[PDB]
Scaffold this active site. Structure first.
Site, PDB file in Angstrom:
ATOM      1  N   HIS A 151       0.445   3.897  -2.958  1.00 61.51           N
ATOM      2  CA  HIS A 151       0.083   5.302  -2.700  1.00 61.51           C
ATOM      3  C   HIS A 151       1.183   6.320  -3.050  1.00 61.51           C
ATOM      4  CE1 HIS A 151      -3.867   4.829  -0.239  1.00 61.51           C
ATOM      5  NE2 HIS A 151      -3.823   4.012  -1.277  1.00 61.51           N
TER       6      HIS A 151
ATOM      7  N   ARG B  81       0.829  -1.222   0.000  1.00 57.10           N
ATOM      8  CA  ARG B  81       0.000   0.000   0.000  1.00 57.10           C
ATOM      9  C   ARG B  81       0.864   1.273   0.000  1.00 57.10           C
ATOM     10  NH1 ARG B  81      -3.085   2.474   4.840  1.00 57.10           N
ATOM     11  NH2 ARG B  81      -4.232   4.149   3.726  1.00 57.10           N
TER      12      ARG B  81
END
Ligand code: HEM
Ligand code: ISZ
Ligand code: ISZ
Ligand code: NA
Length: 250
Positions: free
Chosen positions: A42, A38
């Site tokens: 991101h 993640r």
């Protein structure tokens, strides 16, 4: 394709190799692969092709970018990696975080995503709001992955399969629980679960469900559910592209 990777010194290359090994042990022991994936995603997913702003350039460590609502909880990821990063001062944060993402996929049993060093750490975080909204559908996904990032419909579906590891947290996004029965194992189960319908204890976001009803996304979901090799191939392709947005021209 369309990439011209920069030359980095032999010492830089050595640090990449040594950091990769250290990251494997660390990520495996800390059980934080999904969080690291993640964090890489991101970092990269803010790229806007038309303005050439955002993307995987180390900016996610900035308090200002960590403060973005979409980045809830990623301050944990940044903190966890900081002692390791300090052992590799020659590496850019940009490279280090993307390398952590590649390693996160590998140590959970996923494909070996090619990695090329040379990202520079840029001073300015992108504006907030570029990352996708879990409550929206196929149009929004195309706006974000296609119009902004410049990735394909195939890339969208394959990358959504990144939800094959990890979970949502009600204190972070508000959604809760894992997509799969084995959230530390990288495999095609995300698409299997998506197809079988809802199951108690398992999560599907509206953005996941949007893949099932789209004329282009659905055949890809079906392909990946049926053929994990094809998933791994397309996944490795999409992750590499994601990790290199705005990098190496390109
Ligand atoms: C398709 C658009 C996407 C949407 C709307 C979306 C949304 C979300 C949300 C709401 C969460 C839960 C955050 C939390 O509550 O802790 C999450 C977690 C996660 N996302 Fe996505 N995501 C998308 C695409 C991606 C992509 C492209 C990747 C990487 C290839 C990815 C990898 C992950 C992983 C590994 C987690 C679990 C993190 C953990 O276990 O802490 N997602 N995503
Ligand atoms: N966000 N949760 C984690 O993955 C984690 C957080 C702190 N230490 C190990 C793992
Ligand atoms: N669109 N969902 C997200 O990525 C997210 C939103 C809020 N907090 C954590 C993650
Ligand atoms: Na899984």
């Amino acid at each position: 394709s369309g990439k011209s990777y920069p030359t980095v010194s032999a010492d830089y290359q050595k640090a990449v190799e040594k950091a990769k090994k250290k990251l494997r042990g660390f990520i495996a022991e800390k059980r934080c692969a999904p969080l690291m994936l993640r964090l890489a995603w991101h970092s990269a997913g803010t790229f806007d092709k038309g303005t050439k702003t955002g993307g995987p350039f180390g900016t996610i460590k900035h308090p200002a970018e960590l403060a973005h609502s979409a980045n809830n909880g990623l301050d944990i990821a940044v903190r966890l990696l900081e002692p390791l990063k300090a052992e590799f001062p020659i590496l850019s944060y940009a490279d280090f975080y993307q390398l952590a993402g590649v390693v996160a996929v590998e140590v959970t049993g996923g494909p070996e995503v090619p990695f090329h060093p040379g990202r520079e750490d840029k001073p300015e975080p992108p504006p907030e709001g570029r990352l996708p909204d879990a409550t929206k559908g196929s149009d929004h996904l195309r706006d974000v992955f296609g119009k902004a990032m410049g990735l394909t419909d195939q890339d969208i579906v394959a990358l959504s399969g990144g939800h094959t590891i990890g979970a949502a947290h009600k204190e972070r996004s508000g959604f809760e629980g894992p997509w799969t029965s084995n959230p530390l194992i990288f495999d095609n189960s995300y698409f299997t679960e998506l197809l079988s319908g809802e199951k108690e204890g398992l999560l599907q976001l509206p953005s996941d469900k949007a893949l099932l009803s789209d004329p282009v996304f659905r055949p890809l979901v079906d392909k990946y559910a049926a053929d994990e090799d094809a998933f791994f191939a397309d996944y490795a392709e999409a992750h590499q592209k994601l990790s290199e947005l705005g990098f190496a021209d390109a």
